[PDB]
């Protein structure tokens, strides 16, 4: 026998989260085990595999990685416990302190925690700097670089996720919220498109820029023809000079790049390189290597902030990521909290970063040494971190951004002003539910 704290996450991250899992029993003296369980890969059936044992009352069910936008429909539904049903009282201020403001805004609902994070995730600007002189700071140089790219026959795609899903959607979100707008209000009870003039302004801002990178002179057919892509391989493949993307490209360029398969950047060709492509197909490099292929990489490969929507105002980038929730099935309470303060302390935060590729929430690891020389771009991460946008939080989310995005495809055929009523009026649609 042995009291087991079963803990279910993604199966993409299932070999990181088994290691920390298993640096977790260590400690436990014997007590109990935490035992990692893989869901499905794809996020939408994780929730639904999680929703089908939370309403059949299976009571094996104890700690659970919710995708930070299921906070509002686990809460209502009374799903997760609230933090302050920790029998210890010590799962709320373990998961404020040393938290950054983002990802905790992302936890709560009706002004309390219902869970606390573990991982997080902003989009950042990549660019080539050999052909592109300054990344651009806000939307309107990102039009601009790209048509006149276009002119001088050189790569003219923005390479952005554009198709309809929740990639829309967060795009979508990241430019309202940076114009001072809000899908729906605080507590996702009212649509707040256009119910003032100042926010209409705000919704019809983002409207215009979804629009003027759809038809840009030279813009990638994934868009202007609704087709099936991938942002990540056409900057890879010298097709786009800028791209918006979570930080995963990185480390994805320089193993396709030292496997040979970016053409502008040969790290298979650097002698110290070699080797460094484990049995598995991994760049697993050590320190000297990562920092000879990072330093080869900078005359083809540059990032820099998201780009700003107003002149000044840095942007207010969405979120993602995960946080570690209770579920109302646990028979331990007790052991299931203290499972979740271990599996997000410093260490095992540094883990998940360093050998997961996942950002790390605690801002304690944006001064770790170890950390910034595997992040180079951890001070613009910290940054939109910090000052982050949050997607609307609403138990009927799933059905609020199928919506947003049937409307908002394909964004070629937007009028801002009149796809902005129409946006207003689905959303509404959504919230009476």
């Known amino acids: 026998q042995g009291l087991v704290v079963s803990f279910y996450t993604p199966a993409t991250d299932g070999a990181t989260f088994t290691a920390i ?62 933090l302050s049903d920790d029998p210890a009282g010590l799962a709320e ?30 989009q950042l600007l990549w660019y080539r700097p050999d052909l592109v002189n300054s990344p651009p700071t806000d939307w309107n140089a990102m039009i601009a670089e790209a048509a006149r790219l276009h002119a001088a026959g050189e790569p003219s795609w923005i390479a952005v996720q554009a198709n309809q899903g929740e990639g829309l959607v967060v795009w979508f979100n990241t430019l309202l919220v940076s114009a001072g707008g809000s899908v729906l209000s605080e507590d996702g ?8 003039p100042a926010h209409r302004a705000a919704t019809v801002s983002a409207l215009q820029i979804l629009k003027s ?37 990185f480390a994805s360029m320089l193993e396709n ?21 484990n049995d598995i197909g991994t760049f697993t490099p050590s320190d000297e290597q990562f920092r000879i292929a990072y330093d080869a990489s900078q005359q083809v490969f540059g990032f820099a902030p998201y780009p700003a929507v107003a002149p000044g ?16 099935t646990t028979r331990h309470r007790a052991e299931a909290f203290e499972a979740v303060r271990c599996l997000r302390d410093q260490h095992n935060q ?17 001064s770790d040494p170890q950390f910034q020389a595997k992040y180079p771009m951890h001070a613009i991460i910290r940054q939109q971190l910090t000052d982050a946008a949050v997607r609307p ?3 009927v989310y799933q059905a609020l951004s199928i919506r947003l995005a049937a409307v908002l495809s394909p964004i070629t055929e937007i009028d801002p002003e009149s796809t902005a009523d129409e946006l207003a009026a689905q959303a509404q649609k959504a919230i009476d539910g």
Not at 100 to 122: E, R
Not at 189 to 196: E, F, I, K, N, S
């Open 21 to 82: 899992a298993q640096r977790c029993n260590q400690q436990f003296g014997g007590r109990f085990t935490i035992a990692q369980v893989s869901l499905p890969r794809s996020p939408n059936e994780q929730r639904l595999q999680l929703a089908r044992r939370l309403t059949g009352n299976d009571r094996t069910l104890d700690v659970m990685a919710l995708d930070v936008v299921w906070t509002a429909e686990f809460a209502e539904a009374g799903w997760a416990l609230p």
């Open 313 to 328: 105002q840095p942007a207010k980038v969405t979120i993602g990521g995960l946080n570690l929730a209770v579920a109302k």
């Open 393 to 395: 939080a609403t138990p």
């Open 93 to 122: 201020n373990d998961a404020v302190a040393d938290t950054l403001p983002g990802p905790l805004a992302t936890a709560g609902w009706n002004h309390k925690l219902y869970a606390a994070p573990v991982t997080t995730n902003t």
């Open 257 to 277: 790049a030292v496997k040979g398969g970016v053409p502008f950047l040969p790290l298979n060709r650097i002698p110290q390189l070699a080797g460094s492509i």
């Open 350 to 366: 540094r883990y998940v970063s360093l050998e997961g590729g996942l950002p790390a929430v605690r801002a304690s690891l944006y």
């Open 189 to 196: 009870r009212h649509v707040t498109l256009t119910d003032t």
């Open 213 to 249: 990178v759809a038809t840009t002179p030279g813009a990638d057919p994934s868009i202007t023809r609704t087709e099936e892509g991938s942002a990540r391989l056409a900057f890879e493949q010298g097709k786009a000079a800028l791209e918006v993307n979570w930080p995963f490209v």
